[PDB]
Amino acid sequence: QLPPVVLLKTPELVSGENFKVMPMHQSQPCYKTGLKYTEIEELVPAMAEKTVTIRARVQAVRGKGNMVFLFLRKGIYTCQALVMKSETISKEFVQFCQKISAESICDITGIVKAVEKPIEKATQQDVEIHVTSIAVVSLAEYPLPMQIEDLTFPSSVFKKQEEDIAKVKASAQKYVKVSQDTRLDNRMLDLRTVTNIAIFRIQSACCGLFREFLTSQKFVEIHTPKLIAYLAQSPQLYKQMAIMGDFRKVFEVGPVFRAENSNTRRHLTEFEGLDIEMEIVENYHECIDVMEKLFTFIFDEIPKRFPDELKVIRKQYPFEDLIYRPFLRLTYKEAIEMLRASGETIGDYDDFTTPQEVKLGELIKAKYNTDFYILDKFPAAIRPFYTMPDIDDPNYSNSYDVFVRGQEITSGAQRIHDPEFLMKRCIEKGVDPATLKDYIESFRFGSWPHAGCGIGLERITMLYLGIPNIRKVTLFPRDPIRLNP
Amino acid sequence: QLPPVVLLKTPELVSGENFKVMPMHQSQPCYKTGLKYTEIEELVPAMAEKTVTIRARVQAVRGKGNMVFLFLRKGIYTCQALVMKSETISKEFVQFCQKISAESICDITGIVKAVEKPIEKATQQDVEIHVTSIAVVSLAEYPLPMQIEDLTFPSSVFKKQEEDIAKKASAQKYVKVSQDTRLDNRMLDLRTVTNIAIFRIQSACCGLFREFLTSQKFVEIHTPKLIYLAQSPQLYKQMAIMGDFRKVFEVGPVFRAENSNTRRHLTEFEGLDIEMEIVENYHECIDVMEKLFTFIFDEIPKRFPDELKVIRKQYPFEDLIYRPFLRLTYKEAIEMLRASGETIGDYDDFTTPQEVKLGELIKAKYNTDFYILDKFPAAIRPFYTMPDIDDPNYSNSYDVFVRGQEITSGAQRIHDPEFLMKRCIEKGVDPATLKDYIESFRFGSWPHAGCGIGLERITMLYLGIPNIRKVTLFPRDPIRLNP
């Protein structure tokens, strides 16, 4: 059952002098125009009556016989182009343009002329291009599986739509969107929406700032093996071994594999993990202190460096800006204390249900007015065997979780660096020391007190932007039910 | 046949007031000294007669009854500490110190005193610590599988050793067991100042690569590795461009299923990848590389001078020459090698000796270690490669070389689905095998090009180190999964 490739039809344009379909680009002299390409964001009342040429997507073609309006897009910016019949623009020019298929990539030359009436659908509202020439670089097939326009609508248009269907003749009509597989089967088309390109710039921002900040602190980026021949569930083991190799402060940005078969609405069997590990001098809170600094940096800088992207996301998926000062520090105990006061029955050493984490978020938001906090001193029974126990009560440990919008983004701990004790705990959690000889043995020859972190990139970005589904924040969505594309 | 963990013995020290083994660190009040920890690099004649306390490794203990010399290390820096019997430092203090095992982590307090005679083995040569207190934070087991000193010697030490035996008393020198006694104790090996330096420079490549491309408004992406595994993150990179991302890079693992052990290849490595839209010509992409690499190369010495210094003592090399960045074509390259006497044929891959040879040719003529070979034969490149308009037996692809050896490979790629599919069939590849990839180019498709760089490769070739395993942190191959 071998499914062949399908190839849909492209339009049959009749080319002319100033309106042509270019030959396939092979980096060849005819594409060496020597022109200056102008970026759409630069189209501004500043340059009325200048001529420009710009390589953009023809998102849409509204057409009027003598006038054709081209809606151009490129990245997060959009503008309007106008082809009008004249002494210098012919019937054949116009009908060429009216027949361009949606999403075709074009080079459009024209004179930027002002518009007394603003163009509400475009980002460049106060100016439009009067075309003098066009060249199709890559002519799109048709019909698209999905319209971009109704991929970009905010729910609100849809709330007001389905409620306008109180009508209970022709209830025409409201508008519809297609389902997460018609978009997943055409993921690359979906990613062209301005919201999506914006979402993944902000994911890129989290990654970049995480790297930039830790580097400014003289951390060393490392790359540990994933073919451990099984995969690296957690890059933790090697991270620790890097510290026993006197690296002092290390981080890794890499894939993390959850063999755990897990589909709720926020978990997957492969994600990208931002990990940190460091020597510790007096106290493991030194490690929590680096996080606070670290995250505050990510959260301070994101709006300074990507204001437009944030703007574009908010239209599609409304959210209010994360409140991250103060960074609240509680203990598991205090948390249990609050939830019980809220009516929950929970017991001293129990992991929290996801709802309970959200409820605690709402408690904390009301009392301290932050979306950002850290839960310290988790129960040993919930944490792994490498976790350093608390000196006052071994039923608790030197570990912590960090929360954004009442939900976990990272988890971390001081770890056991004494081999005898590490092995005692390894047996107490029913784990064969034989299974990880080399790891245990690597702590024998003088061993730094240390702690660290595991952050989910998808998770932090999702929670930063208040987006409820993790799949909207992963580029090519991965899970046990979904392989393609 | 289950091999249990072995745990060797630690010394039995008798602790006191100013010389004690601390209890296991559990982030507890007794460790909250409120002192100021001084970094070894700061120990300088500037602060003679100031008192300091510093957490370092006790690399070595030379002892004299009434005097104990502690050789301290910490990262790439080393210094000397002196414990001397007195009114305030006792017999019991001294014999505690003489019994500290190698590599024990310590907090050493003392007064920094000057030394009229320099201490040649330490990085801090003009000053030493007179100890007033010590606290063992983590006491090491013994014996170590390997001495750190003879892990750090430069090849030259053994040449000069055996030739000094041109000569009764003889100079026996040292030596060190094969790459498995070090691989079986990799974390011990990585403590050598050379090694900690090498991997900071690997880190430097990664960071600068990220920093530069980010300053150019590139977007970092993370594409799935559970595809089977992702041999090349190329397919998804291209799909990100068809998603209007414009300029993307990925830093991630790349998996060579190819069973390959020469002295420079492995079945898992870290790849730095780039992909971008292309307006007029794919040399726009080559232009970003030149800028990109020149940045990595310009910045590395500015930001890590000491690490370079430390590496050069172990493994001598002269600084990479990377200006000019030379651009040749495959044709010109063949022309040079033929003129050098090689018989090669127009569309043949180069043997490794031939690449190194061409490196030598280029060094002699242009005096650079850094170049790019453009216009490779189609027959040697993959089916997504855009062919050259003048001659379809060539293609719009290129390899970049450092010290006459490949560090990256790249190309303009085919963005027209019918033609991509024609080529896909000409290279005997089932289009059905990659429907979604091919179909993703159907709805308007940007001309594009990009790159695949080997991190390990660029850092190895940057530092003139011959074995790739010296430049991978936890060496991986089909014969070596452990460690």
Side-chain angles (χ1 to χ4, degrees), chain B residues 330-339 341-347:
Chain B
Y330 204 85
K331 257 168 156 147
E332 282 154 0
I334 294 287
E335 172 176 49
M336 290 166 85
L337 294 168
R338 289 178 181 165
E342 312 265 345
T343 61
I344 187 151
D346 300 358
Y347 314 132

PDB file of all heavy atoms in Angstrom, chain B residues 330-347, unseen atoms left out:
ATOM      1  N   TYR B 330      35.600  22.976  -8.021  1.00  0.00           N
ATOM      2  CA  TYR B 330      36.068  21.570  -8.030  1.00  0.00           C
ATOM      3  C   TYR B 330      37.015  21.374  -9.216  1.00  0.00           C
ATOM      4  O   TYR B 330      38.055  20.779  -9.073  1.00  0.00           O
ATOM      5  CB  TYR B 330      34.887  20.625  -8.152  1.00  0.00           C
ATOM      6  CG  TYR B 330      35.135  19.235  -7.628  1.00  0.00           C
ATOM      7  CD1 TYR B 330      34.971  18.961  -6.273  1.00  0.00           C
ATOM      8  CD2 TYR B 330      35.489  18.178  -8.476  1.00  0.00           C
ATOM      9  CE1 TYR B 330      35.170  17.708  -5.761  1.00  0.00           C
ATOM     10  CE2 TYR B 330      35.702  16.905  -7.962  1.00  0.00           C
ATOM     11  CZ  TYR B 330      35.533  16.682  -6.601  1.00  0.00           C
ATOM     12  OH  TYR B 330      35.712  15.443  -6.037  1.00  0.00           O
ATOM     13  N   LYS B 331      36.632  21.892 -10.381  1.00  0.00           N
ATOM     14  CA  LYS B 331      37.471  21.901 -11.582  1.00  0.00           C
ATOM     15  C   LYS B 331      38.892  22.412 -11.364  1.00  0.00           C
ATOM     16  O   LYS B 331      39.853  21.766 -11.779  1.00  0.00           O
ATOM     17  CB  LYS B 331      36.836  22.783 -12.657  1.00  0.00           C
ATOM     18  CG  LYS B 331      36.131  22.029 -13.766  1.00  0.00           C
ATOM     19  CD  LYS B 331      35.301  23.006 -14.570  1.00  0.00           C
ATOM     20  CE  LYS B 331      35.043  22.529 -15.986  1.00  0.00           C
ATOM     21  NZ  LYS B 331      33.679  23.012 -16.449  1.00  0.00           N
ATOM     22  N   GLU B 332      39.007  23.583 -10.739  1.00  0.00           N
ATOM     23  CA  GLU B 332      40.294  24.190 -10.456  1.00  0.00           C
ATOM     24  C   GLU B 332      41.064  23.289  -9.529  1.00  0.00           C
ATOM     25  O   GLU B 332      42.300  23.159  -9.659  1.00  0.00           O
ATOM     26  CB  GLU B 332      40.115  25.575  -9.802  1.00  0.00           C
ATOM     27  CG  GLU B 332      39.757  26.694 -10.802  1.00  0.00           C
ATOM     28  CD  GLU B 332      38.971  27.870 -10.189  1.00  0.00           C
ATOM     29  OE1 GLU B 332      38.663  27.868  -8.977  1.00  0.00           O
ATOM     30  OE2 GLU B 332      38.662  28.813 -10.941  1.00  0.00           O
ATOM     31  N   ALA B 333      40.346  22.694  -8.571  1.00  0.00           N
ATOM     32  CA  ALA B 333      40.992  21.826  -7.584  1.00  0.00           C
ATOM     33  C   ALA B 333      41.575  20.629  -8.297  1.00  0.00           C
ATOM     34  O   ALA B 333      42.738  20.279  -8.064  1.00  0.00           O
ATOM     35  CB  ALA B 333      40.037  21.396  -6.509  1.00  0.00           C
ATOM     36  N   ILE B 334      40.779  20.009  -9.173  1.00  0.00           N
ATOM     37  CA  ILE B 334      41.245  18.859  -9.961  1.00  0.00           C
ATOM     38  C   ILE B 334      42.485  19.262 -10.772  1.00  0.00           C
ATOM     39  O   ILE B 334      43.459  18.515 -10.863  1.00  0.00           O
ATOM     40  CB  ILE B 334      40.181  18.339 -10.934  1.00  0.00           C
ATOM     41  CG1 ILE B 334      38.971  17.755 -10.191  1.00  0.00           C
ATOM     42  CG2 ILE B 334      40.771  17.261 -11.811  1.00  0.00           C
ATOM     43  CD1 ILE B 334      39.260  16.445  -9.558  1.00  0.00           C
ATOM     44  N   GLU B 335      42.436  20.472 -11.327  1.00  0.00           N
ATOM     45  CA  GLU B 335      43.524  21.032 -12.120  1.00  0.00           C
ATOM     46  C   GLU B 335      44.807  21.122 -11.297  1.00  0.00           C
ATOM     47  O   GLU B 335      45.867  20.709 -11.738  1.00  0.00           O
ATOM     48  CB  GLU B 335      43.073  22.383 -12.646  1.00  0.00           C
ATOM     49  CG  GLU B 335      44.059  23.251 -13.344  1.00  0.00           C
ATOM     50  CD  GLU B 335      43.391  24.562 -13.899  1.00  0.00           C
ATOM     51  OE1 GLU B 335      42.648  25.293 -13.164  1.00  0.00           O
ATOM     52  OE2 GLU B 335      43.635  24.858 -15.096  1.00  0.00           O
ATOM     53  N   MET B 336      44.703  21.594 -10.070  1.00  0.00           N
ATOM     54  CA  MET B 336      45.861  21.655  -9.202  1.00  0.00           C
ATOM     55  C   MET B 336      46.426  20.278  -8.876  1.00  0.00           C
ATOM     56  O   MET B 336      47.632  20.073  -8.964  1.00  0.00           O
ATOM     57  CB  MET B 336      45.523  22.397  -7.922  1.00  0.00           C
ATOM     58  CG  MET B 336      45.316  23.857  -8.149  1.00  0.00           C
ATOM     59  SD  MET B 336      44.548  24.669  -6.755  1.00  0.00           S
ATOM     60  CE  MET B 336      46.049  24.969  -5.788  1.00  0.00           C
ATOM     61  N   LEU B 337      45.567  19.336  -8.499  1.00  0.00           N
ATOM     62  CA  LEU B 337      46.033  17.992  -8.099  1.00  0.00           C
ATOM     63  C   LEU B 337      46.648  17.225  -9.244  1.00  0.00           C
ATOM     64  O   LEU B 337      47.701  16.621  -9.083  1.00  0.00           O
ATOM     65  CB  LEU B 337      44.903  17.180  -7.499  1.00  0.00           C
ATOM     66  CG  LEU B 337      44.406  17.754  -6.178  1.00  0.00           C
ATOM     67  CD1 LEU B 337      43.091  17.057  -5.821  1.00  0.00           C
ATOM     68  CD2 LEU B 337      45.471  17.651  -5.060  1.00  0.00           C
ATOM     69  N   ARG B 338      46.006  17.282 -10.405  1.00  0.00           N
ATOM     70  CA  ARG B 338      46.595  16.759 -11.641  1.00  0.00           C
ATOM     71  C   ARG B 338      47.949  17.379 -11.883  1.00  0.00           C
ATOM     72  O   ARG B 338      48.890  16.668 -12.185  1.00  0.00           O
ATOM     73  CB  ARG B 338      45.693  17.003 -12.842  1.00  0.00           C
ATOM     74  CG  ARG B 338      44.460  16.140 -12.832  1.00  0.00           C
ATOM     75  CD  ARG B 338      43.553  16.435 -14.001  1.00  0.00           C
ATOM     76  NE  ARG B 338      42.357  15.608 -13.967  1.00  0.00           N
ATOM     77  CZ  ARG B 338      41.254  15.818 -14.682  1.00  0.00           C
ATOM     78  NH1 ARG B 338      41.172  16.848 -15.504  1.00  0.00           N
ATOM     79  NH2 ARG B 338      40.219  14.988 -14.562  1.00  0.00           N
ATOM     80  N   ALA B 339      48.073  18.698 -11.712  1.00  0.00           N
ATOM     81  CA  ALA B 339      49.363  19.345 -11.964  1.00  0.00           C
ATOM     82  C   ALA B 339      50.386  18.853 -10.949  1.00  0.00           C
ATOM     83  O   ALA B 339      51.559  18.845 -11.227  1.00  0.00           O
ATOM     84  CB  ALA B 339      49.247  20.830 -11.968  1.00  0.00           C
ATOM     85  N   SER B 340      49.917  18.401  -9.793  1.00  0.00           N
ATOM     86  CA  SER B 340      50.756  17.849  -8.726  1.00  0.00           C
ATOM     87  C   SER B 340      51.120  16.408  -8.987  1.00  0.00           C
ATOM     88  O   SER B 340      51.806  15.789  -8.177  1.00  0.00           O
ATOM     89  CB  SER B 340      49.989  17.893  -7.384  1.00  0.00           C
ATOM     90  N   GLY B 341      50.609  15.848 -10.078  1.00  0.00           N
ATOM     91  CA  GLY B 341      50.895  14.468 -10.443  1.00  0.00           C
ATOM     92  C   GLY B 341      49.765  13.462 -10.216  1.00  0.00           C
ATOM     93  O   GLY B 341      49.912  12.309 -10.629  1.00  0.00           O
ATOM     94  N   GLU B 342      48.655  13.856  -9.581  1.00  0.00           N
ATOM     95  CA  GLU B 342      47.593  12.892  -9.273  1.00  0.00           C
ATOM     96  C   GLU B 342      46.801  12.595 -10.558  1.00  0.00           C
ATOM     97  O   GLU B 342      46.671  13.464 -11.414  1.00  0.00           O
ATOM     98  CB  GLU B 342      46.635  13.402  -8.186  1.00  0.00           C
ATOM     99  CG  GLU B 342      47.270  13.990  -6.920  1.00  0.00           C
ATOM    100  CD  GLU B 342      47.439  13.006  -5.745  1.00  0.00           C
ATOM    101  OE1 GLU B 342      46.816  11.899  -5.745  1.00  0.00           O
ATOM    102  OE2 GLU B 342      48.189  13.368  -4.787  1.00  0.00           O
ATOM    103  N   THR B 343      46.303  11.368 -10.710  1.00  0.00           N
ATOM    104  CA  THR B 343      45.324  11.057 -11.756  1.00  0.00           C
ATOM    105  C   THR B 343      44.019  10.889 -11.020  1.00  0.00           C
ATOM    106  O   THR B 343      43.965  10.086 -10.082  1.00  0.00           O
ATOM    107  CB  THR B 343      45.646   9.744 -12.503  1.00  0.00           C
ATOM    108  OG1 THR B 343      45.633   8.652 -11.575  1.00  0.00           O
ATOM    109  CG2 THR B 343      47.033   9.813 -13.202  1.00  0.00           C
ATOM    110  N   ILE B 344      42.977  11.632 -11.413  1.00  0.00           N
ATOM    111  CA  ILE B 344      41.778  11.712 -10.602  1.00  0.00           C
ATOM    112  C   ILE B 344      40.442  11.622 -11.345  1.00  0.00           C
ATOM    113  O   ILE B 344      39.467  11.087 -10.809  1.00  0.00           O
ATOM    114  CB  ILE B 344      41.805  12.963  -9.771  1.00  0.00           C
ATOM    115  CG1 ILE B 344      40.636  12.995  -8.773  1.00  0.00           C
ATOM    116  CG2 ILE B 344      41.740  14.163 -10.682  1.00  0.00           C
ATOM    117  CD1 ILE B 344      40.957  13.789  -7.503  1.00  0.00           C
ATOM    118  N   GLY B 345      40.329  12.118 -12.555  1.00  0.00           N
ATOM    119  CA  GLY B 345      39.004  12.009 -13.215  1.00  0.00           C
ATOM    120  C   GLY B 345      37.981  13.033 -12.729  1.00  0.00           C
ATOM    121  O   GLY B 345      37.843  13.289 -11.537  1.00  0.00           O
ATOM    122  N   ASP B 346      37.236  13.592 -13.671  1.00  0.00           N
ATOM    123  CA  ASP B 346      36.487  14.809 -13.437  1.00  0.00           C
ATOM    124  C   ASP B 346      35.506  14.797 -12.281  1.00  0.00           C
ATOM    125  O   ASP B 346      35.377  15.826 -11.632  1.00  0.00           O
ATOM    126  CB  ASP B 346      35.727  15.223 -14.694  1.00  0.00           C
ATOM    127  CG  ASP B 346      36.640  15.470 -15.887  1.00  0.00           C
ATOM    128  OD1 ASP B 346      37.876  15.347 -15.720  1.00  0.00           O
ATOM    129  OD2 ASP B 346      36.118  15.788 -16.988  1.00  0.00           O
ATOM    130  N   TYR B 347      34.800  13.690 -12.037  1.00  0.00           N
ATOM    131  CA  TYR B 347      33.706  13.668 -11.049  1.00  0.00           C
ATOM    132  C   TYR B 347      33.966  12.794  -9.827  1.00  0.00           C
ATOM    133  O   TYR B 347      33.013  12.368  -9.150  1.00  0.00           O
ATOM    134  CB  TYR B 347      32.409  13.179 -11.687  1.00  0.00           C
ATOM    135  CG  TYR B 347      32.090  13.782 -13.008  1.00  0.00           C
ATOM    136  CD1 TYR B 347      31.703  12.983 -14.083  1.00  0.00           C
ATOM    137  CD2 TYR B 347      32.146  15.152 -13.192  1.00  0.00           C
ATOM    138  CE1 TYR B 347      31.394  13.550 -15.316  1.00  0.00           C
ATOM    139  CE2 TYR B 347      31.833  15.718 -14.409  1.00  0.00           C
ATOM    140  CZ  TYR B 347      31.467  14.910 -15.464  1.00  0.00           C
ATOM    141  OH  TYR B 347      31.146  15.464 -16.665  1.00  0.00           O
TER     142      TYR B 347
END
